[PDB]
Write a protein that binds this ligand. Structure first.
Ligand SMILES: O=S(=O)(O)C(F)(F)C(F)(F)C(F)(F)C(F)(F)C(F)(F)C(F)(F)C(F)(F)C(F)(F)F
Ligand SMILES: O=S(=O)(O)C(F)(F)C(F)(F)C(F)(F)C(F)(F)C(F)(F)C(F)(F)C(F)(F)C(F)(F)F
Ligand code: NA
Ligand code: NA
Lengths: 116, 116, 116, 116
């Protein structure tokens, strides 16, 4: 997969299921254009956002809708969302995994980048 | 001091010094308007961003310019910046510390919200 | 898998490959008895440590040999190892994933626990 | 103050107050001998563990009793405790801050090592 998003819940020790994720790409006029979106599965994973052909060079933003996730579990969390902003594919195609671990007042995020 | 930002470096085991930090407040037209900014001190801290009178309820974004920090250290990083987006909420007196721990391909962030 | 260990490198944005992992189980005399060991694969994963039958109730320690990992990459890190100590299977068999994200002066660890 | 421990709570967005912390120093027979201990303050901090004269080079372990902390909050946790194991190294003057951010199924820890 060229782009995969994985979200975990540090309170429950589980994948974070049904988390909305929106991806944007910076356009030539410097605005954030919608690129792809989806929801995490029962494994906390979101696959199928894009294809190698579509996922050209650019600056991308992955917005993870953490507030809605916590609210539905009865928690009023600190953050509106978790955002991950990065340049992709500027030295040719890569595969990106964006992972996030969520707590009500914190999050950690990392990237795993591999060359296919 | 109702808002403080603290930035640490997980590669060097040190405060992240001279990191640019920009704070924005969401306007009624849903755009981000500049609110305060500065550079972290030798302790990785940025104080004096705002006052109690000015820091009213609303949605705020703290951008930390991590890419320029890593570039200055000669280390290739993943993210363009780290972003922390949250709502300020008057529920009694409040002080907010936004902390971030930086690595080249990762960051962790937390909020410590206390009442003096 | 009843027990899986996954290790990532926050400096390189990659799995942490060839990391030694030692698992211990607390014995009746309160000493740490060797239980299983192995090394992470090219995907940063270590599978096959134990079986559902062997992995009885108990207190377990997963020791990840982070210092050796960093030293081989030219970094003199802070920690000797990362240790994860937990009670397992005390409400019946579960599947455990122990994940760790490594930096030279930091680590983050989480657990994902699922009921088969 | 050559050694300070700071503990934060990612569920409540607060310092982790009244957490027991035990420090050990590895003896020549390779056992862990008690060195210092205390409970975190209302700021999540534990100062006064040791002195410059006493804190000689060696291998130290900081155990943070996270399970009892979560139990007191009525939250089921994963870990028995969080452990931080490191070597103290005289390379000019040094102060060590060991910080930990706690969630029920996760923890993050970093070291900030500075020269005053
Ligand atoms: O530097 S301080 O010890 O004052 C601190 F505020 F506690 C802190 F270390 F920065 C921190 F807030 F704990 C912290 F940096 F956020 C931290 F939580 F400890 C951390 F471990 F670094 C971290 F969790 F990774 C985070 F910074 F949140 F990313
Ligand atoms: O490899 S997977 O993406 O399936 C994963 F195990 F979930 C993971 F990526 F390793 C992960 F656990 F999510 C993780 F990336 F390590 C993570 F939890 F998100 C993490 F952010 F790296 C982390 F929180 F720091 C962890 F180190 F796992 F605690
Ligand atoms: Na290029
Ligand atoms: Na039982």
């Amino acid at each position: 997969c060229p782009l995969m998003v994985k979200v975990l819940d540090a309170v429950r020790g589980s994948p974070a299921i049904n988390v909305a994720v929106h991806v944007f790409r910076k356009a030539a006029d410097d605005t954030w254009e919608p690129f792809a979106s989806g929801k995490t599965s029962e494994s906390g994973e979101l696959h199928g956002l894009t294809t190698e052909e579509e996922f050209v060079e650019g600056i991308y933003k992955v917005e993870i809708d953490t507030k809605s996730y916590w609210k539905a579990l009865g928690i009023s969390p600190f953050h509106e969302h978790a955002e991950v902003v990065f340049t992709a594919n500027d030295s040719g195609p890569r595969r990106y995994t964006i992972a996030a671990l969520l707590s009500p007042y914190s999050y950690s995020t990392t990237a795993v980048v591999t060359n296919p």
